[PDB]
Design a protein around this ligand. Structure first.
Ligand SMILES: CO[C@H]1O[C@H](CO[C@H]2O[C@H](CO)[C@@H](O)[C@H](O)[C@@H]2O)[C@@H](O)[C@H](S[C@H]2O[C@H](CO)[C@@H](O)[C@H](O)[C@@H]2O)[C@@H]1O
Ligand code: NAG
Ligand code: ZN
Length: 1015
């Protein structure tokens, strides 16, 4: 295994280093507004050394943005694809590339067989080429790597089945900045080349000057280079035709033949295209070849990529003709005039890359190595696209919830083969496709119109119901005596109970377990653990009595805590925000112990008085002017006091101190240790009243944030043996700190209400001497070092926080893990901050055509880990990566992949069993089974199950936490007959494994295995 900590890679371009050196001046470059006037030596090309030009027609099709997926399909995309089929069929030299398989699948299944055959033939002959082949062209900032892989797999599995092709070149012209997670996944999925576009204009200029726009993109920790993927960065401001022929858009626009008027389009530079004729083809060719040779100056080979397309292009037959016939006339002239020394043709993306690598192998170029990312994007001036790290945070959180239930549904159902009547594959396919769709760069990003957001939400809600169905059917099968099992595949044997989605205060969706002497004495509940190690975790349920005790299915008592059900109300009569307690339902909490990838059953039983093994939390309401809080049968009376500082400790865990406003002020890790200052604060950013306005994409604050005025908020303290909390009703946020004996959990119920032109930020203030350094993750996969740059504006120092962030000095680290992607930064030494929501009245001129005025309450979740790190083996000061500790990693897992909870729906479960998976290996803590997916339907004689295994890298800090069992996924199901290593999509076998054993993977590596079973 390569060491991902101690060896700093030697790369030609390291993006953090480049950032430190670059001046980012925004000067007028001339016709290339963000560049310079390019010059070329005309004698560079000659008869023995020609410029080879590939014009690559394309059409950018958003799977929802300003219209829904289905609306765009009906209005635009079905016509684009129908006319592509006809036009390519009839014009054999014409070419076209296609990226978004969601749309292509939607189209193809509506074709008659004759047209399906015609379509297969233009793909097989290379006229129509799929690029990337994902379901969508995903966002790269907010998306989790697991869902990037999911959508990639969804599209490529479709393409292999129906088109018999697997793309090896990726096309990502539209995400708002770019992540190294993409080449990581793509390189492990058979890819050889990728293309990107939306990078900071200053980066484009810098790399163009050095001819470093094509590079071997490796991971930041990769000393050897085995992760490298050849990458092409386009050089100009847009992917449209004016910005793809060359540096002068006034000239390039004249070669977009849809802009002569009858299509309703024109050239903003005020010179229209003219139809090519024999009288003008020489002059027109001179202009165009000059543009091409200038673009070629920015690259190292004599092979040039010229994209030819724009959003929802190639719709009308007349548009196909006007582009094709004019370009054909240009190519005939240019290629026959030896003095240009050019050979130009329509091509595909793979044709371009193949020709580049032929030039490379001929010794005509050597490419630089690069590591780093391409965040935060700015397309012009100070317009940094850090707003979309937060926009529409409800749906960002929903993404993470659905991510987990897709994993859990696929895993739980994979253990068996299912009859088709069970509709398992149907429901899983729907769930995967709806989550996959949402990875679009207008989905999870929060950059779509209101009604489109609603469509994505409705789709995801259906997907969650599909996962629930599959999960609960699977639990019933896994835990019922086989000779008793009698399934009705439409029935709900269990319902899922989720304490954090949509959340208390967002939706009252949880079911109470109703027990009573005259109705039902007890209830079975089941926990699932998707992670491949034993886990203990507190779980809670709502119950109709406080006098409830818990047993395991050996009837062993389990210690439990009962607490009230508190809900917060904005009392419009008193103009305060305060909690009310239920008088008929209560929360019971207990520790569930669940096998690796397994299930555990418990029983809740009512009694007529306090049970021996159940304790009751105390409750203290801090506010002036209190009024009573009755709690029905709950046996401890609420206590009241004036606001005051208070401290809490659960178990032998940290002691937390809180201000009189209910906000953390310090953490004491152990009995004698210092009370370390760690202060939460809520602040507000506003919007500029002159110049450019913040919107869904852009964050353009009117200076540093101002503190939220808190008034005298009401504080609720619950103190229990198993779980304690401090909750406070602040303006726009019910803020909660929860303690269970380790790192606290933070929950924010965020309701920005009608606060227009406001962004609410949560900041942590410490004494940690972090300087200008902080760490943020990329797609939940890796942590990258950030350096705050005072030469850039505030919004430029905001980065995606898809799963966590930290600051550290020599001795102390503070890590904030998130259950949802949000934007954040460290704007001063010792600080962390993360945006909660944003409400914006203006459009920000990027095409959305609305503000963000559709906010809804969202429950954001976090873990806060303060640690001593002086004994940890960390990377050197020059290394661009950072790594989590064990405790921080486990805290992230507790947010993203919690135990699932199931409540048996009927009164009696006949044949119930206590556990599943007790013989599953308990793997080392850094290893995960990211995906378990049965790949075959029940009719297949040889069943196949796919696994994706990911090993992270945790710091060595002198805490072994060892003896663990080897995990061989190929022996998790019986009767294995073959085990193969595959690409991450499962679509190509890479190694036949001896002994049918799937080895574990190296730190920071991800591998896929497929086991086959005879059984
Ligand atoms: C404001 O319209 C202009 O920009 C939008 C940009 O849409 C892309 O980028 C946004 C972010 O800015 C992203 O959210 C979205 O997914 C898209 O990737 C363009 O849609 C239009 S193209 C439009 O008008 C062109 C000029 O007339 C025409 O050539 C094209 O075919 C379309 O009709 C525009 O550039
Ligand atoms: C799929 O593509 C490959 C390569 O051209 C070819 O061998 C095979 O005949 C095609 N059709 C299949 C495998 O069904
Ligand atoms: Zn787009």
């Amino acid at each position: 295994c390569q060491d991902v900590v101690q060896d700093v890679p030697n790369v030609d371009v390291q993006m953090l280093e480049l950032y430190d050196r670059m001046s980012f001046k925004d000067i007028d470059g001339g016709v290339w507004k963000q560049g310079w006037n390019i010059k070329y030596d005309p004698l560079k090309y000659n008869a023995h050394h020609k410029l080879k030009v590939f014009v690559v027609p394309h059409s950018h099709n958003d799977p929802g943005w300003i219209q829904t997926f289905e609306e765009y399909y009906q209005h635009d995309t079905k016509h684009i694809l129908s006319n592509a089929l006809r036009h390519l069929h009839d014009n054999p030299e014409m070419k076209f590339i296609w990226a978004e398989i969601s749309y292509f699948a939607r189209f193809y299944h509506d074709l008659g067989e004759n047209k399906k055959l015609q379509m297969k033939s233009i793909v097989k002959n290379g006229q129509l080429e799929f690029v990337t082949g994902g379901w969508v062209m995903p966002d790269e900032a907010n998306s989790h790597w697991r869902n990037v892989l999911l959508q990639l797999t969804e599209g490529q599995t479709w393409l292999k089945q129906f088109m018999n092709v697997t793309p090896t070149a990726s096309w990502a012209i539209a995400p708002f900045g770019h992540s190294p997670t993409m080449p990581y996944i793509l390189q492990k999925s058979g890819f050889k080349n990728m293309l990107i576009q939306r990078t900071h204009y200053s980066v484009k200029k810098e790399l163009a000057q050095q001819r470093q726009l094509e590079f071997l993109w490796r991971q930041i920790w990769d000393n050897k280079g085995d992760t490298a993927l050849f990458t092409h960065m386009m050089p100009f401001y847009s992917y449209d035709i004016p910005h793809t022929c060359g540096p002068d858009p006034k000239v390039c626009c004249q070669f977009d033949f849809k802009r002569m008027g009858s299509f309703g389009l024109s050239c903003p530079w005020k010179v229209p295209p003219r139809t090519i004729s024999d009288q003008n083809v020489a002059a027109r060719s001179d202009l165009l070849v000059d543009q091409w040779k200038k673009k070629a100056e920015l690259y190292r080979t004599n092979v040039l990529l010229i994209p030819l397309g724009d959003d929802f292009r190639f719709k009308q037959n007349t548009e196909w003709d006007v582009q094709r016939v004019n370009y054909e006339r240009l190519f005939e002239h240019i290629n026959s005039q030896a003095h240009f020394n050019v050979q130009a043709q329509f091509g595909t993306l793979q044709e371009y890359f193949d020709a580049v690598h032929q030039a490379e192998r001929a010794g005509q170029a050597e490419f630089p190595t690069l590591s780093g990312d391409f965040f935060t994007y700015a397309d012009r001036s100070d317009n940094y696209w850090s707003g979309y790290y937060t926009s529409r945070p409800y749906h960002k959180r929903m993404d993470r919830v659905l991510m987990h239930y897709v994993r859990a549904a696929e895993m739980l159902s994979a253990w068996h083969s299912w009859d088709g009547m069970a509709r398992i594959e149907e429901r899983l396919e729907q769930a995967r496709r709806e989550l996959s769709l949402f990875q679009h760069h207008d989905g999870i990003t929060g950059t779509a119109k209101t009604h489109v957001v609603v469509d994505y939400e409705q789709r995801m809600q259906e997907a969650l119901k599909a996962c629930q169905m599959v999960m609960q059917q699977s639990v019933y099968r896994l835990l019922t005596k086989p000779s008793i099992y009698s399934p009705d595949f439409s029935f709900s044997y269990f319902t899922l109970d989720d304490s954090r989605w949509p959340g208390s205060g967002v939706e009252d969706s949880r079911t109470t377990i109703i027990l009573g002497e005259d109705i039902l004495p007890s209830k079975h509940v089941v926990m699932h653990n998707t992670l491949p190690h034993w886990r203990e975790q507190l779980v809670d349920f709502y119950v109709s009595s406080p006098f409830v005790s818990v047993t395991d299915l050996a009837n062993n008592p389990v210690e439990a805590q009962v607490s009230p059900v508190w809900s917060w109300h904005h009392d419009t009569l008193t103009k305060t925000i305060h909690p009310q307690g239920s008088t008929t339902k209560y929360r019971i909490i207990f520790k569930a112990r669940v096998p690796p990838m397994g299930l555990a059953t418990y029983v809740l039983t009512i009694s007529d008085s306090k049970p021996e093994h159940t304790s009751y939390a105390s409750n203290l309401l801090l506010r002036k002017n209190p009024t009573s809080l009755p709690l029905g049968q709950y046996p401890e009376d609420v206590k009241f006091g004036d606001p005051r500082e208070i401290s809490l400790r659960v178990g032998n865990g940290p002691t937390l101190a809180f201000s009189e406003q209910g906000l953390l002020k310090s953490i004491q890790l152990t009995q004698d240790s210092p009370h370390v200052p760690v202060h939460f604060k809520f602040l507000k950013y506003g919007v500029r009243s002159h110049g450019d306005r913040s919107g869904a994409y852009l964050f353009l604050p009117n200076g540093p944030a101002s503190p939220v005025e808190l008034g005298q908020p009401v504080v609720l303290v619950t103190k229990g043996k198993l779980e304690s909390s401090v909750s406070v009703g602040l303006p726009s946020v019910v803020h909660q700190t929860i303690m269970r004996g380790g790192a606290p959990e933070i929950r924010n119920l965020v309701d920005i209400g009608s606060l227009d032109n406001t962004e609410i930020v949560m900041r942590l203030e410490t004494h940690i001497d972090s300087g200008d350094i902080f760490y943020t993750d990329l797609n939940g996969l890796q942590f990258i070092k950030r350096r705050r740059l005072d030469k850039l504006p505030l919004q430029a120092n905001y980065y995606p926080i898809p799963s966590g962030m930290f600051i550290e000095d020599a001795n102390t680290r503070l890590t904030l893990l998130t259950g949802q992607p949000l934007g954040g930064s460290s704007l001063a030494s010792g600080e962390l901050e993360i945006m909660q929501d944003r409400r914006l009245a203006s459009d920000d001129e990027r095409g959305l055509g609305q503000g963000v005025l559709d906010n809804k309450p969202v429950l954001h979740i976090y873990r806060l880990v303060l640690e001593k790190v002086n004994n940890c083996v960390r990377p050197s000061k020059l290394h661009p990566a950072g790594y989590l500790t064990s405790a921080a990693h486990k805290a992230s897992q507790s947010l993203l992949d919690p135990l699932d909870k199931f409540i048996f729906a009927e009164n009696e479960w006949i044949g119930a069993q206590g556990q599943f998976g007790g013989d599953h290996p308990s793997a080392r803590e850094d290893l995960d089974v990211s995906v378990m997916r049965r790949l075959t339907k029940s009719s297949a004689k040889t069943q196949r199950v796919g696994y994706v295994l990911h090993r992270t890298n945790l710091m060595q800090c002198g805490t072994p936490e060892e003896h663990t069992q080897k995990l061989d996924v190929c022996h998790l199901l019986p009767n294995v007959a073959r085990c193969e290593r595959t690409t991450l999509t499962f679509l190509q076998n890479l190694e036949h494994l001896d002994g049918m054993v799937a080895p574990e993977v190296c730190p920071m590596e991800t591998a896929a295995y497929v086991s086959s079973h005879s059984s």
